[PDB]
């Protein structure tokens, strides 16, 4: 919904325009783990520079996610978001079950 | 009580057993036409199965006791019995099965 | 309401745009005395790819239909939906009738 295509008309994930560094590592390439998210180039096209686009597949729910976040990073909802046993990994596994 | 007035008033005879609340009898009287004040005095005294039959299936109201069914049939609703549950000794769970 | 059509303007059935596999395959053809639903290829009409536009038939009633298929799928409706002898195949047919 934020994140910026390098190429206009088509929003592949593959073309990311993620602002980079001047050493050339992106500023911000995001965590997942973290709830920081990436830092992306500004939505301009015009002449003279590189034509960045967009997201062109985005809905209109940023703010019940920015919700979530704020709710992810509040210390408030471990017994919800972050389980003692009950974690889940990126890949979907836990250290235990419901059993 | 809870019983519409209009539905219980056009029942064409009643059977009422050992009634212990006021407003119970209240409306039971209220839903007869075939009040005699010594029959209907007895109500909250009557003995384990005996029933007061008014209306009219029969020539006067009366005093009866109901007639007990053969030995073996009897109503009975098989809901756990707590205490016999409660009493066994515990055994090692398996929620395995169970999940 | 999900399945969107190969060609805009149009919204026949045979125009099915649904997302296939490598060998040519769809993904989720859907199935019927089942409760799995079709796989569609997502709505893009954007250059570089083909022009999908969902269809325009759809009704607002998206939640009902969810929340049926939800109960189709519950053992606790058996009686209700899967009758042992009166169960409705696809084309109407009942084995045993009301009488």
């Not at chain 1, 995001?30 to 500004?42: E, H, Q, R, T």
Request: hydrophobic letters at 35%; glycine letters at 8%; charged letters at 25%.
């Amino acid at each position: 919904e934020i994140s910026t295509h390098y190429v206009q008309g088509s929003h592949s994930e593959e073309n990311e325009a993620l602002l980079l560094g001047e050493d050339g590592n992106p500023v911000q390439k995001g965590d997942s783990l973290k709830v920081v998210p990436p830092i992306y180039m500004p939505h301009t096209q015009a002449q003279g520079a590189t034509k960045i686009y967009l997201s062109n597949r985005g809905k209109n729910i940023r703010k019940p996610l920015e919700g979530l976040a704020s709710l992810l990073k509040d210390p408030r909802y471990e017994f919800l978001f972050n389980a003692d046993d009950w974690s889940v990994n990126l890949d979907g596994k836990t250290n235990k079950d419901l059993d | 009580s809870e019983i519409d007035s209009t539905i219980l008033s056009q029942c064409g005879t009643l059977f009422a057993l050992r009634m212990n609340n006021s407003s119970d009898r209240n409306h039971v009287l209220g839903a007869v036409s075939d009040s005699f004040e010594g029959l209907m005095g007895m109500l909250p005294t009557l003995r384990t199965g005996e029933a007061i039959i008014i209306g009219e299936s029969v020539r006067l109201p009366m005093r009866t006791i109901i007639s007990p069914p053969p030995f073996g049939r009897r109503p009975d609703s098989l809901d756990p019995d707590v205490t016999a549950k409660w009493s066994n000794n515990r055994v090692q769970g398996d929620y395995k099965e169970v999940l």
